[PDB]
Amino acid sequence: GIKGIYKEIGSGERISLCKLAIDHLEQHNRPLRLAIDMAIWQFQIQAARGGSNPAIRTLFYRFVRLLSLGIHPIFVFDGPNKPNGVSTAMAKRLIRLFGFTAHDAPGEAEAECAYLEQQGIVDAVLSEDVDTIMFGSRVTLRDWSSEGGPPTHVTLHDAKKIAEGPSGLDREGMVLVALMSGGDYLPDGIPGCGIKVACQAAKAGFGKELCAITEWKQRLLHELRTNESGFFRTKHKALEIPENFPNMEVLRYYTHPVVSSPATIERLRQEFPPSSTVDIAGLREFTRETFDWTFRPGAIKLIKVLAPGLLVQRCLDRYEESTLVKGISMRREHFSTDATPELRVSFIPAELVGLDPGQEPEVPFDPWQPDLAWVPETILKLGVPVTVEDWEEGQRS
Amino acid sequence: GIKGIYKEIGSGERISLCKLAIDHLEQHNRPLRLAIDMAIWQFQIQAARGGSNPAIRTLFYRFVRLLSLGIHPIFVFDGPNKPNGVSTAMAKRLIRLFGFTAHDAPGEAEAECAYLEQQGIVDAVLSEDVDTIMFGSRVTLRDWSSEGGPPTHVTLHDAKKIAEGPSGLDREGMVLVALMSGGDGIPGCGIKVACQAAKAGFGKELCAITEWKQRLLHELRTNESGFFRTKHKALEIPENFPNMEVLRYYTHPVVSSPATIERLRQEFPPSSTVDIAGLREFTRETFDWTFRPGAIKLIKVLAPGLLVQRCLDRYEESTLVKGISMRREHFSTDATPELRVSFIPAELVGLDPGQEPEVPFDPWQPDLAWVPETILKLGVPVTVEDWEEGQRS
DNA sequence: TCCAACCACCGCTCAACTCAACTGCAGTCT
DNA sequence: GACTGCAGTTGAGT
DNA sequence: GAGCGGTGGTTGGA
Ligand SMILES: [Mg+2]
Ligand SMILES: [Mg+2]
């Protein structure tokens, strides 16, 4: 589901997640909004030794990476109305602590994700696969990973470019494919079929699928048997077709998937994105209880990990004050960001995060000394414009 | 037929021809030797269609299959001393090009095949039916076919096990059945009754003759000893019966001379090198496998079997196998252990398609084939050991 | 007379393989 | 979920 | 050459 689909639509465009975030921020003058299917974690997350709760620990670092990218994420959870070891409660707790949004689909999350995109709530979808396209996604993302090392890239699929050849596969086309082929998921699918043949049926325009039904089935069946119109590579007489085909409690499951109410969509327009303020004291207590980051070493570990992303977040949110950036020392266009212009920024971690390791019991990295980080130039111009200008001025000299 | 013989002796054991070949090779430490009656081909190969000479083409592919099985075949042809649409000359020509042996019976091929087996020239007989048992065969094979696809299996009959119940049909038993059930054979008779006369010991017949005839004739009409299911006064028996010139057609069938048997004992199996250039010219002239495509076609089809022949004939040289990838015990071979070998077809066959006039399978790229582990251990032992030890890792 | 089981006999009917492309399976990592 | 070779099938031509 | 039902004939009994 759908097995062999990337042979037809393509594997997709590998692209820096940083580039997407910054390109969108430049074109639309606001941070990228992303719907993330919570199901993508199950196998990336588990397993990743060791220490205490390494599974949710990996989730923590992914969240910090989201902060540094300046993305407004909304995490969608599955609902009971469908036809690892990481607690949902803990996941949702960490989400809120990071100032992110948790959202519960009434049914399947991937359908809700696609729906949110269609309604303009989010700009793109990050999911397990491209099932989201069947539910109406236009820009869908998968495989958030290294390009190993740090997870910097995703694989982008565009529903409009896919529909424009060579597969000619659109939403209705893929629906027919799933309806005809596998089969191992949906009832009353065709035994000998078959993504190659199904895609050929879709390309022949059969993907309508406009609710009676009796006529369509026999035109399609006659074409399969005789290949008169030449819709297929060969004839297909041995391909006998179930009486429960086309199953239609399946059909709309795709064309009208159970998603949030219109009232819920309107609530989200007003309430998403949220204030997005990272709860520092909350994260300190969470990491202590969950990761055993206890005492002064645990506080310093938190500051080190959290300071860069928190720098980005406040830099975007705040839109005389070197309260964020102490200085700039270099410029680069690195391949990991697909040559996205970044500037080498210096900052004071402990001062930025706002925790004092002295208030913690004592049982190298000094959180009070300057630390360095690469931050996208675009983000820096928005938050610390005067600092960026001074650097630009010094470079002209 | 003998008609309805199989409901008496059993339908036979269906067995992988590969299993027979490899089992015999493991037990006797030399390839299986098989006598093949050329009469089997008549109503099997004329179902092929398309192309040039599809019947002799079918014969070609089965010859290639014989190479892959590592079997040493001797094809027996009929002779004139007996009491569609394939040329004998072309059949014999192709046989020699493959390094196989062609043998002319002085009379019926079946009798000669059985005789060859009795004399130790071959280990088993492949023929149309089971008549070979009457001529003295002990292990006889029939119906070399699919188990619907490639012809991997055969039906084995064992003369010893047949004679050991429940039919009790031995050689002289089946002779009596043949004598009685027509057709100077007895009208109204009768394999059920004939087989019952056999179990009553009447199959001897060791000659004068008049006493014997009047015992079963008295038993047929009275059933005193209970030899039969019922009485049989209906059956009246011809004066000529039992026909004696028929009896020794079975007990002493016209076959090759002792001198010929001795000739075969030292000449078979033969040197047996596949004539590559010969086959190239044959397939060009007969199948219209012309120019570079025809060369490539030959190389692809012939490379695997040719690999086996080298393997067994071996009995460092990576000139056969480039590597091993996997192990399997497939049902088509009756779980005969096979290894997935890689080889270069063109390099192995030894023909360059470049010397042919050109007009997607690349014969210079590695190709894969399943080859019986036993054969591989014999021909390329060092390669097999490297695979075995990398495995236990 | 007739049936019923058994049987010999008649008339009827059938008889491969390559090749490419494909689906589906079972590994596997995640 | 998706990738890889194997296996078995089908359709078309040999 | 072999598997299928039908046919007609023989045998021993109803
Ligand atoms: Mg999915
Ligand atoms: Mg015969």
Author numbering:
A (entry chain C): 2 to 84, 96 to 159, 163 to 226, 235 to 342, 357 to 400, 432 to 465
B (entry chain A): 2 to 84, 96 to 159, 163 to 198, 203 to 226, 235 to 342, 357 to 400, 432 to 465
Task: Give passages from the manuscript.
GEN1 is a member of a superfamily of structure-selective nucleases (Grasby et al., 2012). The structure of the GEN1 protein reveals it to have an elaborated FEN-XPG family fold that is modified for its role in four-way junction resolution. In free solution the protein exists primarily in monomeric form, but binds to DNA junctions as a discrete dimer to generate bilateral cleavage by accelerating second strand cleavage. We have now solved a crystal structure of active GEN1 from C. thermophilum bound to the DNA resulting as the product of cleavage.
In our experiments, we crystallized a wild-type sequence in the presence of Mg2+ ions. The presence of MgCl2 in the crystallization solution induced cleavage of the four-way DNA junction by CtGEN1. The crystallization process has selected a single product of enzymatic cleavage, containing the 30 nt r strand from the junction and the 3′ half of the h strand and the 5′ half of the x strand, i.e., the product with R and X arms. The functional unit is thus one CtGEN1 monomer with one complete DNA product. We have, therefore, associated the 30 nt strand as one covalently continuous strand within the complex and will represent it in that manner hereafter. Thus the functional unit contains a product of resolution, comprising a 30 nt r strand, the 14 nt 3′ section of the h strand (referred to subsequently as 3′h) and the 16 nt 5′ section of the x strand (5′x) of which the first and last nucleotides are not visible in the electron density.
